[PDB]
Design a protein around this ligand. Structure first.
Ligand SMILES: CCCCCCCCCCCCCCCCCC(=O)O[C@@H](COC(=O)CCCCCCCCCCCCCCC)COP(=O)(O)OCCN
Ligand SMILES: CCCCCCCCCCCCCCCCCC(=O)O[C@@H](COC(=O)CCCCCCCCCCCCCCC)COP(=O)(O)OCCN
Ligand SMILES: CCCCCCCCCCCCCCCCCC(=O)O[C@@H](COC(=O)CCCCCCCCCCCCCCC)COP(=O)(O)OCCN
Ligand SMILES: CCCCCCCCCCCCCCCCCC(=O)O[C@@H](COC(=O)CCCCCCCCCCCCCCC)COP(=O)(O)OCCN
Ligand SMILES: CCCCCCCCCCCCCCCCCC(=O)O[C@@H](COC(=O)CCCCCCCCCCCCCCC)COP(=O)(O)OCCN
Ligand SMILES: CCCCCCCCCCCCCCCCCC(=O)O[C@@H](COC(=O)CCCCCCCCCCCCCCC)COP(=O)(O)OCCN
Ligand SMILES: CCCCCCCCCCCCCCCCCC(=O)O[C@@H](COC(=O)CCCCCCCCCCCCCCC)COP(=O)(O)OCCN
Ligand SMILES: CCCCCCCCCCCCCCCCCC(=O)O[C@@H](COC(=O)CCCCCCCCCCCCCCC)COP(=O)(O)OCCN
Ligand SMILES: CCCCCCCCCCCCCCCCCC(=O)O[C@@H](COC(=O)CCCCCCCCCCCCCCC)COP(=O)(O)OCCN
Ligand SMILES: CCCCCCCCCCCCO[C@@H]1O[C@H](CO)[C@@H](O[C@H]2O[C@H](CO)[C@@H](O)[C@H](O)[C@H]2O)[C@H](O)[C@H]1O
Ligand SMILES: CCCCCCCCCCCCO[C@@H]1O[C@H](CO)[C@@H](O[C@H]2O[C@H](CO)[C@@H](O)[C@H](O)[C@H]2O)[C@H](O)[C@H]1O
Ligand SMILES: CCCCCCCCCCCCO[C@@H]1O[C@H](CO)[C@@H](O[C@H]2O[C@H](CO)[C@@H](O)[C@H](O)[C@H]2O)[C@H](O)[C@H]1O
Ligand SMILES: CCCCCCCCCCCCO[C@@H]1O[C@H](CO)[C@@H](O[C@H]2O[C@H](CO)[C@@H](O)[C@H](O)[C@H]2O)[C@H](O)[C@H]1O
Ligand SMILES: CCCCCCCCCCCCO[C@@H]1O[C@H](CO)[C@@H](O[C@H]2O[C@H](CO)[C@@H](O)[C@H](O)[C@H]2O)[C@H](O)[C@H]1O
Ligand SMILES: [Zn+2]
Ligand SMILES: [Zn+2]
Lengths: 217, 124, 79, 244, 62, 51, 96, 79, 96, 124
């Protein structure tokens, strides 16, 4: 019942402010025809009510994936998004969030031979959004597992501290691969939430309920 | 707790004309905002003890599971490859520059607070 | 300054982290299925069986195996 | 056992012992009993005397729950609503526009007003609350607050600018066609009483002129009486927008 | 290697529980703190021309 | 009473001493944005404190 | 006390105690930024060789590229199939 | 009186009750044996077996049985 | 609020609301100490009959002393061996 | 925090002979021991919420296990036989007499505190 006290200007507050304002920047509100004043203020609030919380959803999905991706780079830890049901379960959840938002506009009714082909391109976003997250967390860690085994075969066979320069060159390529997996962990959390703003933002359109009556001049 | 400006007005009005100027540092300190002093040092919080023992229990649980794995020696050397980058990030990252870069991410800390000016609230 | 006020409060967890670890543990313990390498048996079979025959070798791998695939227990020799 | 339960039923589960449990938290219990339809004058007399030493220490949610409860029960206790209006006047910064619109509608149901209560409610909506809180209000609640200030003659032009923000095509469109008529006709009388014709009166007049078949001949006369009065105040001509 | 889990529904409900906790913790604990700190700065910066003008007209000090 | 008046203002806002009393009227204008910038940024920076 | 010393101790190690200056690596190395690149791969190479030296007589689960560690070359350490290597290790274990 | 001072502190557990419930739970989860009606099996057997065949009827008794001995699942019909 | 009312409510029930005085049991009963002995066995007899009425068509795990509940006397409810009673209940369940 | 008798001695010595007798109730209250006032009511503690939810979780776990038992209806009616005695113990036990019987078990509460007498510590 007693909430904690927060220091203003704390680094996690400033980081989460710039992160939230970035995903809110992805689906900006449309500028109305009329100037915004007390006449147009309820139409601006109502247009904000009909807009989905894609700014909140994308920084939910950014923070929950960049925390899960960087667990794969912590020692004694693996990434939750390297599992198939976790990473694709987030991607089908975004696709179902965009579909439910799109279906709630029309009638909750599902919309000659052209539209079965456009449906396959739409329902492939359910697969490809989560699979691109899953394969990137899997194939980078699988390649790290193979090359660590081949790097281990040199000091096992050729002495522990006997000969350095061959096991130095493979430990440099192994160390650059973990640094590449650091870059993929941040980029795939960004690509996921960029695409979630794109997919949900397709159905984030309602008509502006402007003034039906006006006293001109 | 009453507000400090009304305490300034009450203490300045109640003072004598003789000892007004000497007692101004006393009225200044009575209206100074409280800044709590540095309390006694305590080593670990209860939740800090749960967090460190819970992370130690998690590390020992994951190291025991990695050691029983099929590619067990590859798993323990992947912890060496992963912990080496945590050491290199302590060396490479400009932690003062990253602090001020994050400070410029929020508009509340990217600029100074522009509000009430002195001439608008002068009381004569 | 307010620096000594913020050093008074120690480490604190995030505000609803107990509900997060409650939901994650309840997804791992309330699976509605036997636990990963075990099989439910009858009470007649469980009482008659010794502990060494009740264990399986695959569920007890060696902590630091000198050969890949060493198991800690040998299980039931009756096939 | 056919009569052992019936003997227990006539003496224990009675409305009088429903009240004797309800004496501990009157703003909670009177609100939820009257929400369930228990609007009984004999019990709400006992509610009013049980809560009267506690009204001055009630929170804003408890005052709003107690005020809505005595509106649904239609019971007016003037000494109770004096302490209720003394709680709103003492804590007007803590009250919300969503709460005060339910308190004013109870104070408008039976005619009970103070000049200090009208000032502290108007100061709370205009200055102590968010300026877009009338947008979330609903036009039927804002028209009741406008009528409550027009009937008491209390002219607060800063309040009238805040309450008129809530009237729009959004908030009047959410009303029933019969309920939009009573909302439009009561807001246009309150705007003509003070002589205040804001820019958002175009939505109140335009809600009547886009569907005039609901309105009578004398009602369209007093609508276009306000329409020409707002045309002089805002300095223009009234025109209906068609989309396209 | 590990491709399919022991339960696909358990891994999806784990992702649903973690993402709904982050959605709860953002809307309830982080964004009320962020907006108290952001909009104190933002309302002061957006009012300071009109606030100082309104305060200039009010005080009879000059 | 004059000293007690200026003691209250300089206890709350001690940066008023950086403006002389005879030059105060020469800063004013009809609008607040037209007030002379000779003392604006110096008043705002002394008000922030000795640090 | 136990925590207040450990904070003061690691602060001295993280900042004040630098082995780049005490060993005088400015003669051998160009930059401090290239020292921490060599200290990175140097940490990996030590942790590889320490994890192998912590238990050397083991049959590798990683594929050795047709190579043998020491003078074994026919023992259980060098066996390809692990079912044969488990039986050969049990004969080696009772003797040693 | 000091009565209002002692009403300030709420309910509190005994001082080392977390160590008591840690020791009691660790005696019930670190048994070193399969869990009461289950048997450890191979990973080959666990992956090939459906969930309904992996369960046993004795380990699923009926919550309010109309006949003594009703089981919730029927298990594997293969004997 | 939710806890402060519930304390005030149960305090009124524990002390102020007595069904021994409101029902006037001084005419029927001698003492209050013998009322709470009858309220004790009265609580047991209700809880026996409520637990049986919450699910009456069940085969009893307790041994009935050669007696049958209602007009069943040959159904699965009255069967002695529970392996036969389970097969007889499955035929009764699909009809009802 | 200084001790209150030295504050009594300091306040009585510093007062005038004229306003000594009027200010004695003020010096009495300044040396009165602090008795903290009744704070705001809070419904449940955190540990009280764990205790009630943990007892409710334990009751539901044991009622679910009793219902799945072989003699399941005997187990649930044994809870009726056991809870009936908890009701009868609230009726029969003289809770004021048991409180004073337990109070006489400890010698610290069985007698009044016999210590320092008045005549031995009179200060003239
Ligand atoms: C109130 C409590 C505060 C506690 C104090 C803590 C202080 C230490 C800070 C904690 C470290 C957190 C690590 C986060 C790293 C993020 C890096 C970053 O912000 O990028 C740059 C953002 O700065 C920029 O303007 C952009 C420059 C391009 C850099 C590209 C940034 C992408 C990096 C993503 C991380 C990828 C690896 C992930 C590692 C975990 C910073 O560079 P700069 O400050 O030198 O440049 C500013 C101009 N002087
Ligand atoms: C990003 C660039 C690279 C930077 C360097 C590499 C990053 C990794 C380095 C590892 C250091 C991480 C932080 C060090 C924490 C330990 C040192 C420390 O400062 O201890 C403080 C606390 O440290 C911790 O306890 C943090 C540990 C976090 C680990 C979380 C594991 C969770 C396990 C328990 C979960 C149970 C949940 C229960 C829910 C109720 C002491 O706390 P205090 O009470 O004295 O008050 C100070 C508060 N400001
Ligand atoms: C089905 C059988 C499962 C059995 C498995 C075990 C699970 C047992 C369940 C009970 C365990 C305890 C439940 C914890 C929830 C209640 C505690 C709580 O309310 O949270 C905090 C109390 O304070 C609050 O924050 C209250 C706010 C509510 C907490 C979370 C709200 C729900 C979040 C879930 C996401 C909701 C959105 C999606 C919903 C579909 C305390 O958390 P903390 O210790 O980490 O923080 C203290 C650090 N100083
Ligand atoms: C239109 C709006 C609807 C709102 C509802 C939101 C739902 C999603 C929000 C996220 C909560 C997800 C938790 C629900 C998990 C449901 C899983 C399930 O139904 O199946 C379980 C059914 O298993 C059981 O029978 C045992 C009972 C399990 C209960 C699960 C308790 C965990 C609930 C998580 C706590 C959520 C709150 C924590 C913080 C977010 C277990 O799955 P299984 O594949 O392993 O086994 C299937 C049967 N073989
Ligand atoms: C060369 C000879 C060595 C001599 C041996 C002694 C020198 C020390 C060597 C290393 C000791 C490491 C101990 C560090 C943990 C204890 C420090 C600590 O936690 O105390 C404070 C300091 O906390 C920290 O040190 C956190 C710093 C973490 C930042 C990350 C640094 C680099 C990490 C590299 C990644 C390593 C990953 C694993 C690699 C194997 C916080 O607690 P406090 O109570 O004193 O603070 C008051 C608030 N209650
Ligand atoms: C002996 C003669 C017969 C007497 C009557 C029969 C006896 C049984 C009657 C049952 C009533 C038992 C006591 C009633 C407790 C609930 C009512 C209550 O008073 O609630 C208080 C607290 O009640 C409880 O929480 C006690 C519950 C105890 C049950 C213990 C179950 C343990 C389950 C959790 C274990 C987890 C351990 C975690 C370790 C860190 C409220 O606490 P507060 O914060 O408001 O401050 C008041 C403190 N004086
Ligand atoms: C082997 C694997 C087991 C895995 C199973 C899970 C077990 C995980 C182990 C860690 C769980 C947490 C351990 C708890 C012990 C440390 C906490 C503690 O020290 O106790 C209290 C901290 O305060 C103390 O009292 C410190 C005193 C030490 C606690 C107990 C001392 C040992 C008692 C055992 C008997 C010793 C005699 C016999 C020894 C052979 C807090 O307890 P509380 O929450 O109930 O009280 C708070 C209520 N306001
Ligand atoms: C001369 C003075 C000696 C001082 C020592 C005092 C010892 C007694 C004090 C009370 C502590 C008792 C805890 C020790 C339990 C030891 C049980 C054991 O060794 O066998 C375990 C061995 O099982 C295992 O291999 C798993 C590991 C179990 C570790 C037990 C952890 C629980 C420790 C309890 C915490 C004590 C402190 C809590 C508060 C008192 C489990 O027993 P089992 O029959 O179920 O299985 C046997 C193998 N099939
Ligand atoms: C006849 C019609 C019925 C009308 C319905 C309403 C009347 C109430 C009926 C029974 C309601 C029972 C609710 C009792 C639990 C809630 C009371 C409570 O816990 O509040 C306080 C009172 O606590 C107690 O009531 C404890 C009393 C327990 C003593 C034992 C009494 C007899 C128990 C008999 C054994 C029953 C066993 C099970 C039988 C089926 C403590 O919390 P507090 O925050 O208000 O206190 C301030 C400190 N923070
Ligand atoms: C794969 C593509 C996606 C990659 C991952 C995406 C990561 C998302 C987090 C990065 C967001 C940081 O974005 C941050 O937005 C904030 C909004 O407050 C901007 O914030 C700032 O902008 C400007 C200029 O810097 C300042 O004048 C202003 O005062 C301040 O608001 C920062 O300039 C920008 O750095
Ligand atoms: C040093 C230079 C720094 C440059 C910094 C700015 C670039 C930052 C890169 C981060 C990613 C940019 O993020 C970019 O956002 C825009 C809108 O803003 C998105 O644009 C999208 O907007 C909406 C969303 O449905 C659609 O109508 C549109 O068709 C689509 O393009 C892009 O898909 C995304 O790529
Ligand atoms: C969890 C691991 C880390 C993952 C983090 C990924 C998100 C990283 C977000 C930070 C990146 C954006 O980097 C952002 O660059 C912009 C310019 O574009 C800076 O914006 C500003 O910085 C300062 C303001 O003090 C000035 O130099 C200037 O006005 C402007 O450049 C932000 O201060 C910096 O934060
Ligand atoms: C956990 C469930 C309960 C199990 C409890 C079992 C232990 C019970 C201990 C109490 C029994 C002993 O009962 C004890 O009787 C002695 C006399 O013999 C009383 O001793 C005294 O009581 C009072 C003192 O105030 C006087 O009447 C008198 O001086 C003396 O009789 C104790 O006050 C009482 O506590
Ligand atoms: C099967 C046999 C065992 C049955 C179970 C044993 C239960 C054990 C708990 C009962 C103990 C109570 O024992 C209690 O001892 C205390 C010691 O402080 C005595 O305490 C008191 O004694 C006397 C007389 O009453 C007082 O004058 C004295 O001031 C006080 O100390 C109590 O008189 C006695 O009631
Ligand atoms: Zn791995
Ligand atoms: Zn029993």
């Amino acid at each position: 019942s007693s909430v904690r006290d927060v220091k203003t200007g704390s680094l996690p507050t400033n980081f989460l402010t710039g992160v939230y304002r970035f995903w809110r920047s992805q689906n900006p509100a449309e500028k109305p025809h009329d100037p915004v004043n007390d006449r147009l203020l309820p139409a601006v609030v109502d247009a904000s009510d009909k807009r989905a919380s894609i700014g909140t959803w994308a920084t939910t999905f950014f923070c929950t994936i960049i925390s899960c991706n960087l667990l794969g780079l912590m020692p004694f830890n693996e990434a939750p998004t390297s599992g198939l049901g976790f990473a694709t379960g987030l991607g089908v959840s975004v696709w179902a969030t965009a579909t439910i938002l799109g279906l709630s506009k029309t009638g909750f009714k599902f919309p000659f031979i052209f539209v079965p082909l456009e449906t396959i391109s739409y329902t492939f976003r359910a697969v490809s959004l989560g699979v691109r997250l899953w394969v990137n967390m899997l194939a980078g860690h699988t390649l790290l597992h193979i090359l660590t085994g081949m790097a281990l075969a040199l000091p096992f066979s050729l002495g522990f501290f006997s000969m350095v320069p061959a096991t130095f060159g493979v430990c440099c390529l192994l160390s650059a691969l973990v640094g590449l997996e650091y870059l993929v962990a941040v980029l795939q959390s960004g690509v996921f939430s960029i695409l979630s703003t794109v997919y949900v933002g397709e159905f984030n359109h309602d008509k502006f309920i402007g003034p039906a009556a006006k006293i001109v001049k | 707790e009453g507000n400090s400006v009304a305490g300034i007005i009450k203490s300045v009005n109640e003072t004598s004309g003789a000892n007004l100027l000497s007692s101004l540092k006393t009225i200044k300190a009575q209206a100074a905002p409280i800044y709590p002093a540095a309390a006694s040092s305590t080593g670990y919080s209860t939740q800090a003890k749960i967090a460190l023992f819970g992370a130690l229990s998690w590390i020992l649980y994951r190291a025991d599971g990695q050691s029983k794995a099929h590619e067990w020696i590859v798993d323990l050397n992947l912890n060496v490859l992963q912990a080496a980058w945590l050491i290199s990030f302590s060396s490479l990252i400009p932690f003062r520059a990253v602090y001020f870069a994050f400070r410029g991410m929020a508009p509340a800390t990217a600029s100074t607070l522009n509000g009430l000016k002195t001439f608008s609230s002068i009381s004569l | 300054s307010y620096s000594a006020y913020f050093a008074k409060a120690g480490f604190q967890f995030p505000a609803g982290l107990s509900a997060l670890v409650a939901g994650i543990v309840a997804l791992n313990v309330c699976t509605g299925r036997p636990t990963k390498g075990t099989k439910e048996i009858s009470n007649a079979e469980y009482n008659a069986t010794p502990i060494g025959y009740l264990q399986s070798p695959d569920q007890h791998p060696t902590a630091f195996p000198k050969v890949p695939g060493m198991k800690d227990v040998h299980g039931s020799p009756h096939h | 056992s056919q009569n052992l339960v019936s003997t227990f039923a006539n003496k224990v589960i009675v409305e009088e012992n429903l009240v004797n449990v309800a004496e501990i938290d009157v703003p909670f219990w009177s609100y939820w009993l009257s929400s369930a339809g228990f609007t009984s004058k004999d019990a709400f007399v006992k509610f009013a005397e049980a809560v009267k030493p506690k009204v001055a220490a009630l929170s804003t949610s408890d005052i709003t729950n107690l005020t809505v409860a005595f509106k649904r029960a239609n019971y007016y206790d003037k000494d109770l609503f004096t302490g209720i209006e003394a709680n709103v006047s003492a804590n007007f910064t803590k009250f919300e526009t969503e709460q005060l619109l339910q308190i004013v509608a109870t104070f408008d149901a039976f005619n009970h007003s103070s000049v200090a209560f009208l000032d502290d409610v108007a100061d709370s909506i205009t200055y102590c609350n968010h300026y877009l809180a009338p947008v979330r209000a609903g036009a039927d609640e804002l028209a009741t607050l406008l009528t409550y200030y027009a009937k008491n003659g209390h002219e607060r032009a800063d309040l009238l600018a805040t309450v008129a923000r809530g009237f729009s095509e959004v908030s009047l469109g959410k009303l029933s066609a019969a309920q939009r008529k009573d909302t439009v006709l009561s807001a246009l009388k309150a705007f003509q009483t003070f002589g205040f014709y804001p820019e958002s009166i175009e939505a109140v007049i335009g809600a009547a002129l886009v569907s005039p078949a609901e309105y009578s001949a004398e009602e369209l006369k007093e609508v276009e009486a306000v329409k020409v009065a707002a045309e002089n105040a805002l300095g223009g001509e009234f025109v209906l927008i068609q989309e396209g | 290697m590990k491709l399919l889990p022991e339960s696909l529904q358990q891994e999806a409900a784990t992702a649903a529980v973690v993402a709904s906790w982050v959605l709860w913790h953002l809307d309830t604990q982080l964004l009320p703190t962020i907006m108290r700190e952001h909009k104190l700065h933002a309302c002061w910066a957006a009012a300071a021309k009109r606030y100082n003008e309104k305060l200039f007209k009010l005080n009879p000090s000059y | 009473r004059l000293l007690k008046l200026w003691a209250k203002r300089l206890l709350v806002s001690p940066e008023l001493a950086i403006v002389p009393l005879n030059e105060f009227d020469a800063q004013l204008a009809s609008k607040f944005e037209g007030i002379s910038p000779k003392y604006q940024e110096l008043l705002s920076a002394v008000a922030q404190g000795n640090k | 006390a136990v925590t207040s010393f450990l904070g003061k101790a690691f602060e001295k190690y993280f900042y004040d105690f630098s082995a780049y200056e005490q060993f005088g690596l400015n003669r051998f190395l160009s930059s401090k930024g290239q020292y921490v690149a060599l200290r990175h791969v140097g940490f990996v190479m030590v942790g590889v060789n320490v994890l192998l030296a912590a238990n050397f007589p083991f049959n590798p689960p990683f594929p050795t590229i047709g190579m043998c560690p020491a003078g074994w070359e026919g023992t259980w350490v060098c066996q390809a199939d692990k079912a044969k290597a488990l039986e050969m290790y049990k004969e080696w274990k009772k003797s040693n």
